[model samples]
Target: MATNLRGVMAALLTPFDQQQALDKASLRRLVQFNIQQGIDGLYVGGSTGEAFVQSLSEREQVLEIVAEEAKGKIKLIAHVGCVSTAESQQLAASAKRYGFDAVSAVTPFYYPFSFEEHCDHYRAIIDSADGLPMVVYNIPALSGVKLTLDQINTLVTLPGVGALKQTSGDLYQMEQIRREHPDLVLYNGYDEIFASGLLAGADGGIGSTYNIMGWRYQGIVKALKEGDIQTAQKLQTECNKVIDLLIKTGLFRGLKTVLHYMDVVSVPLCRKPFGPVDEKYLPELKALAQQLMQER
Candidate 1:
C-alpha cells in the first residue's frame, strides 16, 4: 500500500559546525544536494544521521529541518527511534507534525529488552504517529536484537507497519520475507550489499553511503531491472571502492570529510567521541572528493 515509499533513499547525515552545533545551513545544502542528485528520497535522523548521539530536542530539530526543506519534494522517512518508548513516541509525534511520509524505529537497545517489549515499543510509537506508516528498522548488528524470520514477519505484519528496512546480511531471510510478503515495502539497509540485497528481493535501499554517491546505487537498481547485469556490477564496484575507503577512515567522519571537500559542509568534524578523519587521509579524501565531483 505504501509502494510509493520504495527507492534508493539516503540515510541522511547531520552536519555540525566546529563548535559541534548543528549546522543548519550545511544541513539545508546537503538536503538540496541529495535532491539535485535525483535521489528518490531522504531518510532523516537514522544511524547514519547520528541520531543516537543527538539529544531528543536535537533529533526533533533534525526532523523539523528536513521536513521544512524537503517536504513534498521527495519522500521523507523520519527515524524517530529511541531506547525509551516514551521518547520515541514523543519523536513520532513530531514526525507526524512535520508531515513526514513515514516513521522508522530501530529495535530498542542497550538493556537487552525482551522481544515483546520491542514490539510494544514499536506499537506505542506507531500509535503516537497517529497514522504515519511504520518502517521497522532491523539492524541486528547495531541493536543486538537479532530477530528470527518469524519475528520479522510478525513485526512487518503489525498494524501500521508499512515497510521493513532489512539491514542484516542474510539474503536467505530476505528472499523468504519477500516470498511471504510480496507487497511489503522492503528496503535494503547496508550500502555495500545494495546489489545483493536487491537481488535477494529488497525493492529499495536506505543507507549512509547514499548520502554521498547515491546515483551509483540508483544506477545499479536501474541497470539490474533492465537486465544489464554488467552495468549494475560495474556501478556497484565503483560504489564499493569509495565504501572501502570509508570503512578505513571511519564512516561518519570520513563522509563528512568528503562532503566538506565537496564544499557542501563547512566543518567535516563529527560529534565528540567520533574523532576527526586521520590527518594522513586528507589527500586521499580530497582526491576522492574531486573524483566524485567530476562524476556529479
Candidate 2:
C-alpha cells in the first residue's frame, strides 16, 4: 500500500512575500516546479516549509494550496505534527480530507516527553490520520528528541505507522533500522548524505535541498540501483557543491534566493527573524542560478 512512497521527495520549502505572508501564488509555482523536476513526491508542512513559523491556520492553507496544485500529479505527505496532539490530529484529519496520500509528523520538540509519551504521541497522531499511513519523522538534530534503535523499532511498528523519515546523521543507526525492519518504508532525510543513506538502507529520501535540485537526487537513486557507483558519486558531488554554498549562505534563505533567481519564487525572503540571504552572497547565488538554469 505504501509502495508509492518509495523515492526522492522534496521536503517542500514555504515561500513568503516581502510582508512575510504565505505567498500562495509562489507556493503553487514551487509545487509545479518540483513536479516538473520529476521527483516522486512532496512532503508538505515539514521543517523546510517552516511549519513552526506559521500558525495552524496558515499551515493548513499551505497544505490546501499544495493539494490543489499537485494532488493528482505526484504523491503528497502532509506533515501534521505539532507539539499539541489535538492540533496535530486536527491537521491530520484535514490532510485526509484534502486527500493526502499519507501523513508524517516530526517527533515533538522543546519539552522532552518520555519515550512512552513519544510512543503515545505517535499512536494518537496515527489514530487521527484515520486510514492514512504515517511517516514517522525522526529528525533529532533539530527536534532534539533522539530515539535509539529500539525506540525507533517500536515507533515504526505502531499500528498505523507506514514509514520513517530518518533525518539523523547516524548511518549506523540507519543501517540497523533497515536490518530490523526489512519492509519498512525507510527514508533518508538528510540531502547531503542521501546516497550514503541509501547505501545504509534507506529505500528513499526526503530532504530540503530537493526543492532546488531534485533530479540530481533521483539520478543518484537511479545510478545506485543500476550499479553505476561512479554516476551516483558524481551526482552527489554536484549536489554537495550547491549544499556547501547553501550552508555558507544559510540553507532555506539561500535556497529561496536561488529559486528567486530562477523565478520559481518571488521574494527570496523568509519570515521575520529569518532575514534575507546575506548581501555578500548575491553574486555567487546569481552565478549558481545561471549554472543551475543551464543544467536544467
Candidate 3:
C-alpha cells in the first residue's frame, strides 16, 4: 500500500552458507540480480525466505541487508508474520524501521482457533505496523485454517488491511474475494496457476518462481493484460515447464536448485533442516530450466 505494489515480485529467497549463517554479500548480489531482472518488488521473510525455520534475529539481519540494497530502487514488502503475536509485532516494527514499503503477515497457525481468535491475531500485527499498511497472507493448506467469507468481509474493512496474498487455486474463492474487497490489493500465490489468477483479477503475483524467472513473467503479464491469449499461453507453458517439475521435486527445493542455476547468489542453499533436491537430478533440472528460458 505504501508503493505501487503491483507487477511481478519475488518471494525473495534467503541465501545461506554451509555454516548456516546469513551470506550478507551474496544477499546483496541477489537483490541486484532481482533489480536487473526488472522485478517490481521483493517479498522478504516469507515462506520462501525460510523465515519460519530460522531465528528472528536472522530475519532481522536479512531485512537490514535487503532494505539497504533495495530501498529507493524498488518496492519492498516485509513478511512479518509469526505464530507468536509478540514476535510478529517486533518484526513488523523492525520492517518499518528498516524502510520496507509495506508489511505482510500470515494468520496464526497450529491451533484450532475460532473466528474471533483470527481477528485478534490479525489485529495485533496490524496495530504493530504503526502507519504502514498490512497485507494478509492466507495459505490455509499449510496453516491448517481456512477463513470463511464472513471472516473476510470483516477483515477487508479493517483500517490498515490493504492487500491479500491468497495461495489457493479455487477460482470461486478468488472471485469472491476480488468481488468482496475490490478496495484491497490482491496477489496470486500459486505459480502453476498464475495466468488464471490474472483472469480472476489479481492485482499481481507473488511467488517463489519469481526469484529465478521473474523477468519472463513480465512478458506473460503483459500478454494477458493486452488480451493476447495466444502469446500468454505460450509463455505460461514455458514458465510452467519449470514450475510443474518444481512442484514435483519440492517447491522450495526445486527453487533452490533453480537459484543455484540462476547464479544470483554465490551459494543458493536452504537452511539447517531443509535442503536441495537430489544432487544427481539438480543438473538435469538446471538444464530443463535453461531450456525453458531458451525456448522463449
Candidate 4:
C-alpha cells in the first residue's frame, strides 16, 4: 500500500470495556470508523491509546487488531515508545512484524537523562528497528524533556529517523526544525494548532481529535493548499470550539463518548484513574457533536 509519512493521522483512542480490558470487537469497529471516513492514517498505541497504562503485550494486541483491519486501507504509524529503549525496540519490532507502515516513539520521560543518553536511546531503538522508518515523537508537555535544535541535529543524523511529530506549542521552534530538516517529514500533534504548524511547513497533522473528525482536518489541509486561508481559519475556529469542550470534560473519554453515541465503540469508559466522564456533560457534548454533524 502507498503511504505518506507526512499525512494527517489519528492518534487513535483505545476502546475499553467497563472491566478495563481491551474491547476487541469495538476495537475493530473503531478501525472501520477511521477507514470509512477516509483518514490519511491511524496512529496506534500512542498516549491517546492509553499506552502508559497498558502492558507491552496489551499494546501489541491493540496493534494487531488495527493492523489486521487497516494494513491495506490506509497509512499506519504504530506508537511504540516506552521508558526503556529495549521495550521501545521490542514494540517497534512487533509493529514492523505486524506490517505497520512506520513506527514512532515519544521522548523517554519520567527521569532527567542527559541529551547524549537521549540520543543513545533513539539510536538504539532505531538500530533495533532494523531499518524500518522511524519518526521522532516530541511532546515537551507530556515528556517533560525538550529537544534543542542542536540535539535534533544529532537525532536526524541517526539511522532511519526521518520525521518529526512536532507536538510542542512553539511554532517558532518548529519553524527552525522545518528549516533545518527541510527534507525530514514534519507533522504536528496538536489539532487546534495544526494550521500554524502547516504554515510553518509541516506536511500534515497527527492528532487525537482526528479520530472522530479526520475529514474536517483533511479539509483544513485542503483549503490551506488551495489558498483558502479564510475557509481554513473558519474551520479551525469551529473545531476549537468543540476541542474546548473536550478539554473541559476530558479529551480521550469525551472523544470515546462521541464514538459510543455513533455506536462505533462498546462504551465510553477510560482506564483506571481516568474516567467515563460525568453524565451531566454528555448532553452538551452530544449537542456539540450534532451541531458539527449538521454543518457537515
Candidate 5:
C-alpha cells in the first residue's frame, strides 16, 4: 500500500503567459515555494492547473517542470484525465516516464459515461502506465460525474487503483465511503471541510488554497494528529477565512493574487471565462491575508 501521499497535497496552479504559453520559471518557483511551506506532495495538471484548457504538449510541459523541480523533495501525483481516454492514457504514460509517484484521472464527464465506461477509462490508464498507482479524482462539479459508495468500492478493487480524491464536498457521502473502506486512502478535496475530514479519518487532503496557506493548514493537521483539539479548531477557523475568500472571490484569481503579493510567483493571470480579480478586490484581499497572518 502507498503510504507517503497521506497529508496536505497541493494542487499546483499552472502559470501561463498572456499568450497562454507555459511559464517554466514560475512553475519552478511555485514548486520550491510549496516545498518550503512543507506540503506533502504536488498535484500536477488538475482543474486548478487548467488541465482541461491546455493541449497535451502543454500539459506535458507543466508536468516536466514540476517533476524536475520537485524531484526529491515532494511526491508528485499527476492528474492525467482528459475528454478522451486515449489522451488520459498518453498523459499517464508521460507521467510514468517523468517518474511521478502516482497518476490520477477525473471521472468521465460531458457525454454521461456509465459506470462501466468510467471503469474502462481508468483501467486504460492503469494499463498504459504499466501498473503505476492510479487515484480516482471525483470532482463532480467540474467533471459532471459522481461515484457512489458501491462504485468506489468496485473501482478500488481494480489493479493499480490506489486512492480517491473526494472533492464533492458531501460529508455524508465521504463518511459513508470512509466507513466502507477503512483501508483505502481518502484525500479530502474541499478545503472548507478539511478539519472535519481529518476527524472523519481522511488520510490527507488535496486542495487549491493550500498553494498559499500550505504551512498553516499543515500545522492544523499536525495539531490534530497530536490530539490538540483546541488548537486544531482555532487553526481550522483561521484557515476557513482564507478558504471562504478564495471560493467567493474566485479560486484561481485569489491564489494568483496571494502568490503575486508574496513574490513567490509573478502576477500570472487566470484563464478567461473566469474574470480577472477585480482591482477593487485587491486591497480587501491583501488586508484579509495580512490580518490572517498577523493573528497567527
Candidate 6:
C-alpha cells in the first residue's frame, strides 16, 4: 500500500537537562527545527534518543512530546521496540493515541532466540499496535538476531508490518531485501551509506546524523531526484568527510559535538558508561562542521 511517510526522516536526539531529566522544551525546539528544515518525518525514541537506557514512562514522554509538537505538521514514527513485548505494545499504543503516523520495533534480543521466536516477537508487537503501520527494525549487529529473507517475508505478510528499517549496513542483504520484496518500504538506516542505498532503491532513510545534518542530506537527495549529479556528488563528498570524522572519533560523541557546536543541543553527553565527548575532539569536530558548512 502506498503511504505518505517517505523521504529523509530524522531520528531525533533526546535532549536532557543537567540532572538527566527529559528537556521537553529543547526536544520540542528540535522537532520544530527539523520540520522547518524540511525533514519529512521524525523517528523519535530510537537509538539516538537513547531508548534502551530510558524507562517506560520516559519513553512514553518522549513520544508524547514529539507527537504533540509535530501534530499534523510532519509524520511521527515512534521506535517502540524494547526487550519486552508488553513494553513495546504499550509504547506503540501510546504512539497511536498521540497520533503517530507509524510505529517501529527492533527485533528482540539479549538472549538466544530461534527464528520462530523472532517471528513471534514481531508478531506480538504488530498485533499490539492495533492497526498502526509497523516497521521491522533489523539491526543484526546490535540486536544479535538476524532474520533470513524468508523470516522477513513472513513478518511482511502481517497486516501491520508496513516497512523495514534495515540497519545492518550490509549492502548485500539490503539488495536482497529490495529485490525480494519490492513492495516493502525500505529505509536505509545507516546514515553514512545513504547515497549507496538510494541508488540501490531505498525509499528513503532514517538516521541519527540527520539530527545534525538533515538539511544537507535532504538537499543532496533533492539534487539527485532533480538529476543534479554534480551537486549531489559535492554533498556526498562533504557527507563522507563528516562520516570519516565520526568514525575516527565515535558516533554518539562526534554527533553530539557537532550538535553542541551548532547550538542545536547542549554540550554532548551520553549517560553513565558512555560519557561526554572528549575535550581533545571538540576542536576537530568544530573545525569539521565549519568546513562542511563552507562546502559548495
lDDT (tens digit, per residue) of candidate 1 on 1-296: 23399899998999999899999999999999999998899999889998888999999999999999999899999999999999999999999999999999999888988779888989999999998999999998998888999999999999999999999899999999999999999999888889999999999999888878999999999999999999998999988898999999999999989999998999998888998788999998999999999998
lDDT (Cα atoms) of all candidates against the true structure: 0.92, 0.91, 0.83, 0.86, 0.83, 0.81
* lDDT for 43 (candidate 6): 88
At residue 131, candidate 6 shows an lDDT of 77
What TM-score does structure 4 among the candidates reach?
A: 0.96
Give the Å error, residue 72, model 5.
1.7
Residue-level lDDT tens digits of model 4 in 166-260: 88888888888878888888888789888778998788889998877888889889999999999999888877887998998899999999888
In terms of TM-score, how similar is model 6 to the real structure? Answer: 0.93
TM-score to native of every candidate shown: 0.98, 0.98, 0.94, 0.96, 0.95, 0.93
Estimate candidate 5's alpha-carbon lDDT, on a 0 to 1 scale.
0.83
Give the clash count for each candidate: 0, 0, 0, 0, 0, 0
Pick out the ten consecutive residues of candidate 4 with the lowest summed lDDT: 287-296
lDDT value for model 3 = 0.83
**What is the lDDT, from 0 to 100, of the residue 283 in candidate 3?**
69
Question: Which residue pairs collide in model 3, if any?
Answer: none
lDDT, candidate 2, 97-211, per-residue tens? 9999999998999998999998898899889889999999998889898788899999999998989999988999999999999999999988888999999999999988898
Tens-place lDDT per residue, model 5, 84-201, is 9999999999999998999999887889888998898889999987756888888888777767778888887788888989887778888888888887889999888788887776
lDDT of 2 at 211: 83
lDDT, model 1, position 92:
94
What is candidate 3's lDDT per residue for 71-144, written digit by digit as tens? 98989999999988899999999999998888998888887778788788778888888977888888988888
RMSD (CA, Å), each prediction: 1.1, 1.1, 1.8, 1.3, 1.8, 2.1
| After superposition, candidate 5 runs with Cα above 4 Å error | 1-3, 288-296
Against the true structure, candidate 4 has what lDDT? 0.86
Give the winner by lDDT: 1 or 5. 1
Q: What is the lDDT of residue 239 in candidate 4?
A: 79
Model 1 residue 83 lDDT score: 91
